[PDB]
Amino acid sequence: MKSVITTVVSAADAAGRFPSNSDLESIQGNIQRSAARLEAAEKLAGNHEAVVKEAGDACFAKYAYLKNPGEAGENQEKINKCYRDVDHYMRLVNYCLVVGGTGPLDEWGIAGAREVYRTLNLPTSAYVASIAYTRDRLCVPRDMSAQAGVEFSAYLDYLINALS
Amino acid sequence: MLDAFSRVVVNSDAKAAYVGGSDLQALKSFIADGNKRLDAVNSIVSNASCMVSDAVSGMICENPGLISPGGNCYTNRRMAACLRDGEIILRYVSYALLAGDASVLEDRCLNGLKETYIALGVPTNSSIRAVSIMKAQAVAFITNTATERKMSFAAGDCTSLASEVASYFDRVGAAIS
Amino acid sequence: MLDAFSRVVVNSDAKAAYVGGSDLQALKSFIADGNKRLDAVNSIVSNASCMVSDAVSGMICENPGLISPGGNCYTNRRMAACLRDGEIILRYVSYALLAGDASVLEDRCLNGLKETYIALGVPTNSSIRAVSIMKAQAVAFITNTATERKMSFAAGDCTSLASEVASYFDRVGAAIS
Amino acid sequence: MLDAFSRVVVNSDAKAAYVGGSDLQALKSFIADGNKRLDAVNSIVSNASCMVSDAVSGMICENPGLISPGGNCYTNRRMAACLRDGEIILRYVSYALLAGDASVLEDRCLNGLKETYIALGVPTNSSIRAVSIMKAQAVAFITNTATERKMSFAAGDCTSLASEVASYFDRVGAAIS
Amino acid sequence: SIVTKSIVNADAEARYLSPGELDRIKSFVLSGQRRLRIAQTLTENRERIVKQGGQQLFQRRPDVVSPGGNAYGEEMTATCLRDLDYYLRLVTYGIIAGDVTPIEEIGLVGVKEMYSALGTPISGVAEGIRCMKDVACSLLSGEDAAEVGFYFDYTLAAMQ
Amino acid sequence: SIVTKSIVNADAEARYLSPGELDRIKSFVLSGQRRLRIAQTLTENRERIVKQGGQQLFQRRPDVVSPGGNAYGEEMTATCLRDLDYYLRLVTYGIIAGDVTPIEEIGLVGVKEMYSALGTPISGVAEGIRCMKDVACSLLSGEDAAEVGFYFDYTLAAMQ
Amino acid sequence: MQDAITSVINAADVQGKYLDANSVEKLRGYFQTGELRVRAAATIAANAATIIKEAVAKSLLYSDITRPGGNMYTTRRYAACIRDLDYYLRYATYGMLAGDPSILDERVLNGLKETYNSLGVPIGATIQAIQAMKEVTGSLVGSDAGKEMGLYFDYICSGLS
Amino acid sequence: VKLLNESGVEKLVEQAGPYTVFAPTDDAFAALLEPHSFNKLATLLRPENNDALRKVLMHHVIPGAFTSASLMDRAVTVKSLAGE
Amino acid sequence: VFGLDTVPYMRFRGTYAPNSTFNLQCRLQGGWARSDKKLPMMSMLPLNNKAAIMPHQIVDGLPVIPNSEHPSQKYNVPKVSREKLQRELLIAQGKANALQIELDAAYTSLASSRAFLAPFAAMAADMDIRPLYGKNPQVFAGQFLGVGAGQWGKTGADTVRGRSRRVAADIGVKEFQLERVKQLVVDLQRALALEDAEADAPATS
Ligand SMILES: C=CC1=C(C)[C@@H](Cc2[nH]c(/C=C3N=C(/C=C4\NC(=O)[C@H](C)[C@H]4CC)C(C)=C\3CCC(=O)O)c(CCC(=O)O)c2C)NC1=O
Ligand SMILES: C=CC1=C(C)[C@@H](Cc2[nH]c(/C=C3N=C(/C=C4\NC(=O)[C@H](C)[C@H]4CC)C(C)=C\3CCC(=O)O)c(CCC(=O)O)c2C)NC1=O
Numbered sequence A: 001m002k003s004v005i006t007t008v009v010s011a012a013d014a015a016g017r018f019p020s021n022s023d024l025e026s027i028q029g030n031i032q033r034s035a036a037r038l039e040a041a042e043k044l045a046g047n048h049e050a051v052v053k054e055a056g057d058a059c060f061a062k063y064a065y066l067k068n069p070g071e072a073g074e075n076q077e078k079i080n081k082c083y084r085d086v087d088h089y090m091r092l093v094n095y096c097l098v099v100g101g102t103g104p105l106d107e108w109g110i111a112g113a114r115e116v117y118r119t120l121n122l123p124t125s126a127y128v129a130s131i132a133y134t135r136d137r138l139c140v141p142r143d144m145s146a147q148a149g150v151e152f153s154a155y156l157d158y159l160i161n162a163l164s
Numbered sequence B, C, D: 001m002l003d004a005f006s007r008v009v010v011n012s013d014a015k016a017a018y019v020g021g022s023d024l025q026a027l028k029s030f031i032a033d034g035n036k037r038l039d040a041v042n043s044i045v046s047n048a049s050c051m052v053s054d055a056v057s058g059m060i061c062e063n064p065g066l067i068s069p070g071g072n073c074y075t076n077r078r079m080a081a082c083l084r085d086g087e088i089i090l091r092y093v094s095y096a097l098l099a100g101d102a103s104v105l106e107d108r109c110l111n112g113l114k115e116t117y118i119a120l121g122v123p124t125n126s127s128i129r130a131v132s133i134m135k136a137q138a139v140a141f142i143t144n145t146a147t148e149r150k151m152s153f154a155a156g157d158c159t160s161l162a163s164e165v166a167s168y169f170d171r172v173g174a175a176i177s
Numbered sequence E, F: 001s002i003v004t005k006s007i008v009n010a011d012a013e014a015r016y017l018s019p020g021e022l023d024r025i026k027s028f029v030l031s032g033q034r035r036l037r038i039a040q041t042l043t044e045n046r047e048r049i050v051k052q053g054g055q056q057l058f059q060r061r062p063d064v065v066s067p068g069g070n071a072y073g074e075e076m077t078a079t080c081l082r083d084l085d086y087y088l089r090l091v092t093y094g095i096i097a098g099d100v101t102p103i104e105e106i107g108l109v110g111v112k113e114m115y116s117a118l119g120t121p122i123s124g125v126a127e128g129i130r131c132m133k134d135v136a137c138s139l140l141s142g143e144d145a146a147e148v149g150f151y152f153d154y155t156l157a158a159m160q
Numbered sequence G: 001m002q003d004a005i006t007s008v009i010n011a012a013d014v015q016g017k018y019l020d021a022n023s024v025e026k027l028r029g030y031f032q033t034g035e036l037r038v039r040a041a042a043t044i045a046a047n048a049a050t051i052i053k054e055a056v057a058k059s060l061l062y063s064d065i066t067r068p069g070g071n072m073y074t075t076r077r078y079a080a081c082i083r084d085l086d087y088y089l090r091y092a093t094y095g096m097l098a099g100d101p102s103i104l105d106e107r108v109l110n111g112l113k114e115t116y117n118s119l120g121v122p123i124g125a126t127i128q129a130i131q132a133m134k135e136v137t138g139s140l141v142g143s144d145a146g147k148e149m150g151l152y153f154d155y156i157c158s159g160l161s
Numbered sequence H: 001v002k003l004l005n006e007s008g009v010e011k012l013v014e015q016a017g018p019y020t021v022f023a024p025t026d027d028a029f030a031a032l033l034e035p036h037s038f039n040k041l042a043t044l045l046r047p048e049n050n051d052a053l054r055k056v057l058m059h060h061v062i063p064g065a066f067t068s069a070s071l072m073d074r075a076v077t078v079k080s081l082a083g084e
Numbered sequence I: 001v002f003g004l005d006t007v008p009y010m011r012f013r014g015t016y017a018p019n020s021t022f023n024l025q026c027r028l029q030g031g032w033a034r035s036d037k038k039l040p041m042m043s044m045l046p047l048n049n050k051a052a053i054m055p056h057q058i059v060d061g062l063p064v065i066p067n068s069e070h071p072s073q074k075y076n077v078p079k080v081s082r083e084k085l086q087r088e089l090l091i092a093q094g095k096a097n098a099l100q101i102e103l104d105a106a107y108t109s110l111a112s113s114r115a116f117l118a119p120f121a122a123m124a125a126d127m128d129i130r131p132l133y134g135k136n137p138q139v140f141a142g143q144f145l146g147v148g149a150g151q152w153g154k155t156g157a158d159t160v161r162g163r164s165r166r167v168a169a170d171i172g173v174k175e176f177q178l179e180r181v182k183q184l185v186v187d188l189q190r191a192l193a194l195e196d197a198e199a200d201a202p203a204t205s
């Protein structure tokens, strides 16, 4: 769970020293950003029915071959579990925009990701098609502020780079 | 480990929900008082030295039986181990105060220290008191009620942080008891 | 570890005697349908990757609480550990089938697994349902009664090898119960 | 007897299923070592008839005055009724062992028995001698130190169980006193 | 049962069975043998009847098995075929009883309430029953098929 | 109407209106002005309400307009939108009356019989009414939308 | 039947007392929650059929009681039990609006266990269906109204057990 | 009564149907501690064996109302709720 | 593994091969605050399968995780005397047994529900079902392209209905209360062995 405080406390812990001015300095960086990266968590928390519906069918629009017989979404519960997965991923992005780190993305969606999908034959292109669609559906002055728009997109492109 | 921001996330993940505004405030009060917290911890780290010497010598000043032929802090090797342990406990309490959460002070300080002190023969009555004191010094340094040294600050109330570190210290005391 | 040839030697060494012709016919029968055994094991190595997916997804298809938030196979890290463990168990059952003896299955795999899962909080019921689905797949692949895929072979009976692997799978089930 | 253990498992009870059940108390007694209690009460019910016979013959070959004319064990009815009484006391103390609790031993046989034997003129000390003989036979059957009789058990110690019936037989012998 | 219904209808009036009711009971016990034969034929051809009725239903009503329909998926289709088997069994009961009392007391009283509470369209069940009726009457003679469809028609009327 | 219902409920008991009933009539005549305003807003935005409700219905229930569905074709779709307009008009009547008497006496008593005789799925009508409810409540204030959806909810409950 | 107001007035009248400060306390308490109660009652009236359908689906829809031999096998019995569940939901809504379970005692629980015992209706399955209905109802009406409704649901289950 | 309640047979005997119950007294259950009947019913104490306790209990319930005067000098064979 | 440049460390690697060495591994290195000054001999008896290694001794050697849905009651257990802790173990053991011996009955009910619909599914296999829409992009499926308006559900398995899926949830709810009470006996054993090791020091016990 790499946040900004977990980074400095464990770094001080290695040498068994007392939190010095380096370690105190990093926490005020989680004061100036964190007044406005939590408004993105407001935008994600109240809009999450619509942003995972709008991104859930974007991958099926790009990849219509999945809905055939004996594929990722062969039947209806395949699509239900796919929308479940897009909801899970946007929840971890909402966590990362809150904590101030990529911890909850890493150890809950990114660690062991490739393995599962590979064995479960879940195309990675379908998963990145939704997050990439959500990244460019956002325009800055309508949905959030300027500080929120960059930090919300930065957690999305981090997961895009991690998934493929 | 966790901090104050992570514990609401862990608590809300076991309820399958996003970070709404219903519990986002308490964090704004926690983030709004960030400067006060940083004023609080610096008061303990700056007097971390004198705190262990005032604590461990006071332990013997109230118990002259832990230094006699057959007492744990008796010899020169054991005194260094006890003065080391006191400062380790103070270091983890300062970690928990800076974090706002007590996640690091439960699985990396008190976890597995009960049987460790039982296999060595470290008195439990002398340990509790030792840690209990460090608490009286910390609540005096937080509120700037220290009789020997005063520091410079902006004026106001700090009993919330004094209470948080007071709850951390007897949390240390309850685990080794 | 042992195999089918070594277990009669271990059993006869605790009796202090040579290997005569009296019991020199069960091993010759192990030899004569030994080519059936090599025909038997290859059908499991051919479908080993589909067997774990059909097993572990069927486990959730009969129990949706494992993926409820908090469940054992809930997050992405835990799903990989469970899909890894299923294939480890299948690998050791294939070792025991090729060996003709369950010695390699006991010590390297099942020795200490039950309270390992107890300490980790792994639910035993779902684990038993996971090994039993793989048992049902293995006895269908041995006898070529698989509805989705058929293989090429020489004709005849293979219920002896199907029963050996069926006895290995609930031997796995009894140890973790 | 039959209701000594809870046996909660029920299907479509409409009172039991989806309703509170003795889970906290009944289950713990059963888990904790009920196999030893079951071998115990089996070692009583397979030996009961020889126990009361040997007990009353030991009482008679100690005190012949009951078999003399004018004695309480003279007459056709007395021998039959005294055998019946001793066996009833044995059955109740066997239940009290099986329950791990001496309440029904009070409520169904020991409640008002002494005044009954006074009203019938039954001598008390001979019956005390009888129940002490049954106590010795019971602890002999429970240590598997019967010089004449053998059952095979799973290996282990039943010392805690043995005291139980000594406390119960002393409860009977004090309540008749 | 015809005997039961005659007995109750005579019981309410506080009279013995008139010679007409006894005549009809006699005619019923005389035809019981071909009733059992027809019940035999319908009973032991149940698999083909349910299968071919399910086909005609799913071709006539593709919405119920379309994506999201009430019988959408493997389990729901199996449950619908289970219901069709239920009604075929009830029809055999009614054939041997000589009257729709078994069919109506089991499976018709309150059927609309049940299927409305389950979210199932009752017209789909009626279509399935009609398809099963055609399939089953195909395997009987002229007079036998006429007498057997006599009960399918009642089940359809009650299930409007 | 609230006045009418109070008068009948007092008439059956052979008594004048108690001060509670008169209090409630007074409160009703005092709120009549905002009742008329809300009826205005709902009344004169009927085209958008019916159109957007028809969309949400047809996207939620594609079977009714699928090939062969009850509202399949130009004429049938027009008739379904006509029905939705009927129910919006009844909701405006109920809003001005202060009670669901107009809605229930016209369009709710015997609605299941009518729609069963026509072959129309009543659940589709309920879906259309719910979609119209969301569309119409989107155009009102908080308290106004709460009071207006109060009648859509009753119409949905009666149309189960 | 008596609601919270009727109960307070009765407690005051049975002593020849005027409504003192404690009665005012209880009356204010009821008046503050009345609007939430009306909201919950409206929402429950909106979705009664779906609540009953979902509770039956989660509680006893695929169990053995719906199969031959079970206590709700035929269509008559299925319809009768769903009507019973509708009764329970409607009367729980009445009790929640009134803030007093006396209507449940007078109109529902009086002689219900005896009727079910004479008919052979399983009580445990009924209590479990009511518990499942409590879940869905609290779900639909939110936390506070769900606790209010669950009070009377548990009242019915205790009176039935 | 305790066994009827925890076994689930209470629902059967609470029905309105005319039953003749042959309930054994507490003396009867205490008299199972002899060897023969113990060997047959000891495993009914284990908490997983409710299915056989149910049949043993159901064997005591007879459909129909047989009074004692009804049975004088008569030999009747019936089926109890256990099906035996 | 370590090469020429890494300080050695406790290797946690998901194969661990022989399972037994993993329980040995967490027993040998337990806790962050335990040291090796004054500890008894540990591993001759578990290496020859004689002393079963304790389950809580693995928990004290494992690195701790954030998702702790059965949180360790090592610190919420109160300081109560040894005999009442013995009693509270036995109630929890009995209740862990009673929740097990009905969970197998739920498994039998699932296996019976599949026998209820065995030939119906065989009939349903070979019969052609062609859906109305939703499988090809030329037709108008509406909101059944994928599912509509937040009705994917918390899991995909809760949306789908059926006889077997309904007893699946029954298995999944008696599940979580079995592993609730089974994670209670581990820390109770950790308290009991704790007080026995307290008695083994030179003291009044
Ligand atoms: C907390 C973090 C978290 C995640 C990141 C996801 C990741 C994830 N997805 C799946 C699992 C799945 N993901 C899909 C989705 C798809 N497959 C298809 O058939 C479609 C093509 C495609 C839609 C995009 C399906 C169908 C499963 C179930 C596996 C299967 O049925 O084969 C599973 C297995 C458990 C399950 O069924 O949910 C996990 C852990 N889930 C999580 O809990
Ligand atoms: C929290 C995450 C979050 C998002 C990423 C967006 C995603 C998003 N966009 C739209 C919907 C829209 N979004 C825009 C915005 C834009 N289109 C453009 O061409 C411009 C470049 C850009 C900013 C002016 C427009 C014009 C629509 C309506 C048309 C459409 O659906 O694209 C909607 C439907 C309702 C709405 O408008 O909000 C949603 C959920 N909203 C969110 O709540």
Ligand SMILES: C=CC1=C(C)[C@@H](Cc2[nH]c(/C=C3N=C(/C=C4\NC(=O)[C@H](C)[C@H]4CC)C(C)=C\3CCC(=O)O)c(CCC(=O)O)c2C)NC1=O
Residues within 6 Å of the ligand: B047, B050, B051, B054, B057, B058, B060, B061, B062, B133, B136, B137, B140, B141, B145, B146, B147, B148, B149
């Ligand atoms: C021989 C007998 C002997 C003693 C009884 C103790 C004396 C002593 N002093 C303090 C108490 C304290 N000790 C300190 C420590 C310090 N004060 C400063 O300002 C410095 C920075 C730093 C040491 C250099 C502080 C801050 C307090 C709190 C009260 C105070 O402000 O003085 C306490 C804790 C009170 C309690 O138990 O609750 C004790 C027991 N020391 C001894 O040697």
Ligand SMILES: C=CC1=C(C)[C@@H](Cc2[nH]c(/C=C3N=C(/C=C4\NC(=O)[C@H](C)[C@H]4CC)C(C)=C\3CCC(=O)O)c(CCC(=O)O)c2C)NC1=O
Residues within 6 Å of the ligand: A024, A025, A028, B032, B033, B035, B036, B038, B039, B040, B042, B142, B143, B144, B153, B154, B155, B156, B157, B158, B161
């Ligand atoms: C690493 C360097 C660094 C720090 C140490 C802190 C330093 C610091 N503390 C305060 C500011 C303050 N600090 C305190 C704290 C206290 N006042 C008292 O009377 C008690 C002695 C003590 C309680 C613990 C209070 C009460 C304020 C003003 C109110 C507030 O900031 O919320 C301020 C003014 C800015 C503000 O108003 O927030 C600054 C810069 N911040 C930093 O960037």
Ligand SMILES: C=CC1=C(C)[C@@H](Cc2[nH]c(/C=C3N=C(/C=C4\NC(=O)[C@H](C)[C@H]4CC)C(C)=C\3CCC(=O)O)c(CCC(=O)O)c2C)NC1=O
Residues within 6 Å of the ligand: C056, C066, C072, C073, C077, C078, C079, C081, C082, C083, C085, C086, C088, C089, C108, C109, C113, C116, C120, C122, C123, C126, C127, C130, I013, I014, I015, I016, I017, I018, I019, I022, I065
């Ligand atoms: C040589 C033999 C051998 C094995 C058998 C495995 C046994 C094993 N499994 C796990 C570890 C695990 N095992 C599971 C598995 C499951 N949870 C369930 O309910 C299902 C029944 C099952 C999946 C099918 C999970 C989920 C974890 C990780 C626990 C967690 O992080 O939450 C661990 C701890 C190491 C780790 O975290 O990866 C070990 C040693 N490993 C071995 O080396």
Ligand SMILES: C=CC1=C(C)[C@@H](Cc2[nH]c(/C=C3N=C(/C=C4\NC(=O)[C@H](C)[C@H]4CC)C(C)=C\3CCC(=O)O)c(CCC(=O)O)c2C)NC1=O
Residues within 6 Å of the ligand: C047, C050, C051, C054, C057, C058, C060, C061, C062, C132, C133, C136, C137, C140, C141, C145, C146, C147, C148, C149
């Ligand atoms: C969502 C719900 C869901 C399920 C209920 C299961 C479905 C399922 N399939 C099998 C059963 C099986 N699964 C396989 C596996 C395979 N078959 C092949 O030929 C391939 C090579 C390979 C996977 C690609 C085999 C061989 C069987 C045995 C029956 C058969 O031959 O199909 C079993 C075991 C039967 C038992 O429990 O005893 C189950 C439960 N999967 C699910 O997802």
Ligand SMILES: C=CC1=C(C)[C@@H](Cc2[nH]c(/C=C3N=C(/C=C4\NC(=O)[C@H](C)[C@H]4CC)C(C)=C\3CCC(=O)O)c(CCC(=O)O)c2C)NC1=O
Residues within 6 Å of the ligand: C032, C033, C035, C036, C038, C039, C040, C042, C142, C143, C144, C153, C154, C155, C156, C157, C158, C161
């Ligand atoms: C690594 C490569 C390699 C193999 C895989 C096996 C391949 C193999 N299997 C068989 C031969 C056979 N294999 C089978 C086995 C089966 N037949 C069935 O109907 C079942 C599907 C299955 C049961 C498990 C039987 C019954 C025979 C013929 C009888 C026999 O060989 O004893 C033969 C013919 C030689 C012989 O008669 O022994 C060969 C070459 N041998 C090899 O060298």
Ligand SMILES: C=CC1=C(C)[C@@H](Cc2[nH]c(/C=C3N=C(/C=C4\NC(=O)[C@H](C)[C@H]4CC)C(C)=C\3CCC(=O)O)c(CCC(=O)O)c2C)NC1=O
Residues within 6 Å of the ligand: D047, D050, D051, D054, D055, D057, D058, D059, D060, D061, D062, D132, D133, D136, D137, D140, D141, D145, D146, D147, D148, D149
């Ligand atoms: C002169 C009259 C006279 C007798 C009739 C016997 C009666 C008798 N038996 C035992 C003692 C015993 N009696 C039994 C009972 C039995 N042993 C078996 O193997 C059978 C199964 C069962 C019926 C025979 C047992 C097991 C003991 C203890 C072992 C022993 O002493 O033989 C005792 C000693 C009890 C005590 O006080 O400690 C006496 C007095 N002895 C006598 O002195």
Ligand SMILES: C=CC1=C(C)[C@@H](Cc2[nH]c(/C=C3N=C(/C=C4\NC(=O)[C@H](C)[C@H]4CC)C(C)=C\3CCC(=O)O)c(CCC(=O)O)c2C)NC1=O
Residues within 6 Å of the ligand: D056, D066, D072, D073, D077, D078, D079, D081, D082, D083, D085, D086, D088, D089, D108, D109, D113, D116, D120, D122, D123, D126, D127, D130
């Ligand atoms: C529930 C528990 C329970 C019991 C224990 C017995 C107790 C008991 N015993 C007797 C009755 C008797 N009990 C004895 C017994 C003895 N006399 C002796 O000298 C010996 C000490 C001893 C046998 C070893 C005799 C001899 C009688 C008959 C006395 C008589 O003839 O009147 C009676 C009077 C009724 C009768 O005469 O039968 C009762 C209530 N009954 C019970 O219901």
Ligand SMILES: C=CC1=C(C)[C@@H](Cc2[nH]c(/C=C3N=C(/C=C4\NC(=O)[C@H](C)[C@H]4CC)C(C)=C\3CCC(=O)O)c(CCC(=O)O)c2C)NC1=O
Residues within 6 Å of the ligand: D033, D034, D035, D036, D037, D038, D039, D040, D042, D142, D143, D144, D153, D154, D155, D156, D157, D158, D161, H042, H043, H046
């Ligand atoms: C329903 C009938 C029924 C029984 C009779 C018992 C029979 C029984 N006893 C034990 C098992 C045992 N039984 C005993 C008891 C004893 N061992 C001795 O040497 C002493 C003489 C005696 C003390 C009273 C012991 C010590 C064990 C092994 C530990 C235990 O399981 O309690 C076991 C489990 C292991 C095994 O199968 O052997 C069983 C089934 N259990 C039952 O379910």
Ligand SMILES: CCC1=C(C)/C(=C/C2=NC(=C\c3[nH]c(/C=C4\NC(=O)[C@H](C)[C@H]4CC)c(C)c3CCC(=O)O)/C(CCC(=O)O)=C2C)NC1=O
Residues within 6 Å of the ligand: E064, E065, E069, E070, E071, E072, E076, E077, E079, E080, E081, E082, E083, E084, E086, E087, E106, E107, E118, E120, E121, E122, E123, E124, E125, E128, G061, G062, G066, G067, G073, G074, G075, G078, I161, I162, I163
């Ligand atoms: C003996 C008289 C009798 C009948 C008829 C009966 C019906 C009955 N049908 C059921 C379900 C069902 N029935 C269907 C049926 C259909 N779906 C369609 O689209 C078609 C129109 C129709 C098939 C022709 C479906 C899909 C379910 C499952 C519904 C669900 O679980 O969501 C259920 C609940 C689960 C179960 O089967 O136990 C019952 C009790 N019970 C009875 O005692």
Ligand SMILES: CCC1=C(C)/C(=C/C2=NC(=C\c3[nH]c(/C=C4\NC(=O)[C@H](C)[C@H]4CC)c(C)c3CCC(=O)O)/C(CCC(=O)O)=C2C)NC1=O
Residues within 6 Å of the ligand: F064, F065, F069, F070, F071, F072, F076, F077, F079, F080, F081, F082, F083, F084, F086, F087, F106, F107, F118, F120, F121, F122, F123, F124, F125, F128
């Ligand atoms: C004021 C109260 C009131 C109502 C509601 C009413 C309804 C009504 N709806 C009708 C038809 C119809 N109604 C529909 C409606 C629908 N099709 C669907 O699939 C949907 C579920 C639904 C639209 C939401 C259709 C398709 C018809 C024509 C049926 C036919 O002619 O076959 C007809 C016959 C023709 C006509 O409109 O005159 C009447 C009388 N009459 C009334 O007096």
